[PDB]
Amino acid sequence: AEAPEAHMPTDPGPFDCMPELLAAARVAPVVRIPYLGRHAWVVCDPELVRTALTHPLLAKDVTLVPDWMRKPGLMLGSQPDPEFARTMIMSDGAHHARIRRLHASILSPRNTERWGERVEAKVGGFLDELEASAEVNVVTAYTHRIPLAFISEMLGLPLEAERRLRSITDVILYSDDYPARGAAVGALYGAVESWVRDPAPLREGVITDLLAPPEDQVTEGEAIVWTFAMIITGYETTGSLISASLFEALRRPPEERPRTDEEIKGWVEEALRVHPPFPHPTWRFATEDIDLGGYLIPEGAPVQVNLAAANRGPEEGPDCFTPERQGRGHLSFGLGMHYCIGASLARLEAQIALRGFLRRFPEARLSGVEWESEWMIRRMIVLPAEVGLE
Ligand code: HEM
Ligand SMILES: C[C@@H]1O[C@@H](n2c3ccccc3c3c4c(c5c6ccccc6[nH]c5c32)CNC4=O)C[C@@H](N)[C@H]1O
Ligand SMILES: C[C@@H]1O[C@@H](n2c3ccccc3c3c4c(c5c6ccccc6[nH]c5c32)CNC4=O)C[C@@H](N)[C@H]1O
């Protein structure tokens, strides 16, 4: 059986595309959407999504992407030569295992109480910078600054570049102009290469550790590609999870807000389920013809999965935050081989940032909220609040 045709917003703009994406999951478990003049398959039924994420015949190597998707400014049209270096999310099999293993030998000994106390020290400083200022946009004043400040110190980037990097990735991930996206992607690659080949303006951190001393040798090219990947993924979605968690707390009476360590952990989990920063993740390609739920996915087919629809049943709807659910059964970090490597980091930062704000402004309220989203990324750009007093 062939998958029927539905419609998702493919270009980013100032709207919340959530009702359009959940409406396309109602078409069929597998659907075909118009994308870049051709079509793309998407899995929408939750269990069918969970099997697609693990499918042995759905690969992600850059040798499989057809030419009509390799457009400059987009991820698939921005990869390097796979023989020189591959990014972790776009490798398969033993290639992926080596890249993932080398990334996990970084920063030994990794103690999360150390990671967290530094997350806490930065959350306090931005809460103070906030208190040093009646409506407040907590997105631009809090949720944006925290994950950026940590990943820069963790990577060891020079403090001068931190103010400029937010504006570069903003274009790569949310602009609707392809030339601007092609320029911002090249600007990041050219800056990363300058830092790796000449590590003088860098602080000791992750990057200098990859350029250090048998079988765990990281080439200069892999150091650049992996650093680029970690700048693209290292803070943007973490800030979207922080703001999304705060939105659901600020909109409720202070009594219904989490206070315990357990309720804060369950709160950030339910925010991941309801507001996936990646409503659809990265691309996969059928190495053989596949049937999923009676629907055909032909060979070489580009396939995506509806994480926003897999996180909900047929009953929920776009606004379905339930503190009792605690995000049980969400697929927002992926599953299996390519499960998010920075999931523990994004959780601990979301948990610390959400608790830090609620302990500092116990009488905060929302009192509008604007989104920026496409079918593959979703974020709040203002969350206007009224903070009250400490
Ligand atoms: C809450 C924020 C985050 C979300 C929602 C998120 C989501 C995801 C998802 C869905 C994937 C899998 C994509 C797929 O299978 O198609 C993924 C993979 C990945 N994420 Fe995250 N992520 C987050 C935070 C981070 C952070 C902070 C880092 C880096 C520190 C990071 C680095 C990665 C990497 C490297 C991969 C690729 C893993 C692999 O293929 O082996 N992510 N992320
Ligand atoms: C990932 C890509 O990197 C950019 N790129 C340059 C950007 C600026 C200057 C030179 C290149 C350059 C070169 C080459 C490749 C290449 C070979 C195989 C597969 C992908 C490749 N990409 C190459 C590439 C080979 N010899 C070169 O000089 C283009 C951009 N469309 C983006 O898709
Ligand atoms: C707008 C969002 O980001 C876009 N994106 C690029 C857009 C342009 C150039 C490079 C990338 C790029 C890269 C990577 C990821 C990635 C890794 C894990 C999970 C999600 C990810 N998204 C990545 C990504 C890793 N290394 C990269 O170069 C793709 C788009 N589908 C959407 O996810």
Give the Å distance between the CA of 77 and the centre of ligand 2.
Answer: 9
Return the H-helix or E-strand segment holding 381: strand 377-382
Q: Is residue 155 classed exposed, middle or buried when 0-12, 13-18 and 19+ CB atoms within 10 A define those classes? A: buried
Note whether 331 and 220 are within 8 A (CB).
Answer: no
Residue 58: strand pairing partners:
286
> DSSP secondary structure string, 116-173?
HHHHHHHHHHHHHHHHT---EEHIIIIITHHHHHHHHHHHT--GGGHHHHHHHHHHHH
CB of 179 sitting under 6 A from ligand 2: no
Ligand nearest to the CA of 305: 1
Ligand nearest to the CA of 102: 1
Q: What values do phi and psi take at 315, rounded to 5?
A: -105, -30
CA-based Rg of the chain, rounded to a whole angstrom? 21
Find out whether the peptide bond into 109 is cis, omega within 30 degrees of 0. yes
Best residue for ligand 1 mutational test, from 340, 375, 376 (most atoms within 8 Å of Cβ):
340
CB of 80 sitting under 6 A from ligand 2: yes
Ligand nearest to the CA of 101: 1
Alpha carbon distance 278, 376 (integer Å): 5
Give the Å distance between the CA of 175 and the centre of ligand 3.
Answer: 14
Could you give the angle at which helices 343-360 and 261-274 cross, rounded to 10 degrees? 120
The 3-state DSSP class for residue 86 equals coil
96 annotated to a ligand binding site:
yes
Note whether 204 and 220 are within 8 A (CB).
Answer: no
Sorted by sequence, the CB contacts under 8 Å of residue 381 that are 6+ apart come out as 14, 139, 140, 370, 371, 372
Among the listed residues 293, 136, 127, 103, the one whose alpha carbon sits nearest the alpha carbon of residue 210: 103
Give the Å distance between the CA of 341 and the centre of ligand 1.
Answer: 6
Nearest Cα residue to atom 7 of ligand 2: 186
> DSSP secondary structure string, 14-48?
SS--HHHHHHHHTT-SEEEEEETTEEEEEE-SHHH
Tokens found for residue 114: 């150390």
17 annotated to a ligand binding site:
no
DSSP letter (8 states) at residue 76: T
Method used to determine the 3D structure: X-ray
Give the Å distance between the CA of 229 and the centre of ligand 3.
Answer: 8
Resolution in A: 2.3
CB of 84 sitting under 6 A from ligand 2: no
Note whether 6 and 31 are within 8 A (CB).
Answer: yes
144 annotated to a ligand binding site:
no
CB of 340 sitting under 6 A from ligand 1: yes
Give the Å distance between the CA of 8 and the centre of ligand 3.
Answer: 19
CB of 79 sitting under 6 A from ligand 2: yes
Return the H-helix or E-strand segment holding 31: strand 30-35
For 237-376, where are the E strands, in sequence order? 284-286, 290-291, 296-297, 302-305, 370-374
Please, what are the domains in the chain?
Answer: 18-385 (1.10.630.10)
* Geometric angle at alpha carbon 36, from 31 and 39, rounded to 5°: 25
Alpha carbon distance 202, 205 (integer Å): 8
Alpha carbon distance 177, 170 (integer Å): 12
Note whether 208 and 156 are within 8 A (CB).
Answer: yes
Give the Å distance between the CA of 356 and the centre of ligand 1.
Answer: 24
In the structure, which protein residues have their CB atom closer than 6 angstroms to any atom of ligand 3? 74-75, 78, 87, 89, 172-173, 185, 228-229, 232-233, 278, 281-282, 376-377
CB of 205 sitting under 6 A from ligand 2: no
Among the listed residues 101, 89, 44, the one whose alpha carbon sits nearest the alpha carbon of residue 297: 44
